[PDB]
Amino acid sequence: GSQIPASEQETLVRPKPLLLKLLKSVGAQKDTYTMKEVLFYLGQYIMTKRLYDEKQQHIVYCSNDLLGDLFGVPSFSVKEHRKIYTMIYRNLVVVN
Ligand SMILES: C[C@H]1CC[C@H](Cn2c(N3CCO[C@@H]4CCC[C@H]43)nc3cc(-c4noc(=O)[nH]4)nc(-c4cncc(Cl)c4)c32)CC1
């Protein structure tokens, strides 16, 4: 959907080892993050590796990339905000 709630975007999370690896590949140096930071780094990961489609740039192709293994889909749109949340939550432990 869109506009995920503020307190969700601020949830403190511990990425599991695969998502941690990805985060660390774009310069993140922590064990714990907010969701908004995780999304920031994944953003950066996609930009830097150019995983977006050249012609339809809201589509991300993640087959044959680590991102593909994290999300378990061959692609997704950047407009599908809840789906993205949902795929990322599988890859982390909420901090209590
Ligand atoms: C998995 C990963 C999560 C973060 C997003 C960030 N992000 C991006 N980036 C930003 C960094 O550079 C990147 C290269 C191509 C993609 C570029 N562009 C978005 C467009 C829309 C959009 N356009 O129309 C709409 O409705 N949303 N949304 C977000 C968005 C921001 N924060 C939270 C959410 Cl869940 C989504 C966008 C990309 C995907």
Which own/partner pairs from 30-35 qualify as long-range (CB within 8 Å, at least 24 positions apart)? Answer: 32/95, 34/9, 34/10, 35/8, 35/9, 35/10, 35/11, 35/85, 35/88
**38 alpha carbon – ligand 1 mean position (Å):** 12
Distance 78 CA to ligand 1 centre (A): 5
| Residue 61: closest CA among 42, 40, 75, 47 | 75
| Domains assigned to the chain | 6-94 (1.10.245.10)
Q: What is the dihedral of CA 54, 57, 62, 63, to 10 degrees?
A: -40
Phi, psi of 16 (to 5 degrees): -75, 165
Residue nearest to atom 1 of ligand 1 (CA): 42
Total Cβ atoms within 10 A of residue 19: 23
Ligand 1 shell residues, CB under 6 Å: 2, 39, 42-43, 46-47, 52, 58, 78-79, 81, 84
Q: Which atom of ligand 1 is nearest to the CA of 40?
A: 4
Taking the centre of ligand 1 as the mean of its atom positions, its distance from the CA of residue 67, in whole angstroms, is: 14
Ligand 1: which residue has its CA nearest to atom 17? 43
Structure tokens at 91: 């890859």
Helix ranges restricted to H, 1-96: 6-9, 17-25, 35-49, 66-71, 81-89
Asked if 22 and 4 count as a contact pair (C-beta separation under 8 A), the reply is no
- Beta bridge mates, 13: 33, 94
Taking the C-alpha atoms of residue 22 and residue 66, their distance in angstroms, rounded to an integer, is 7
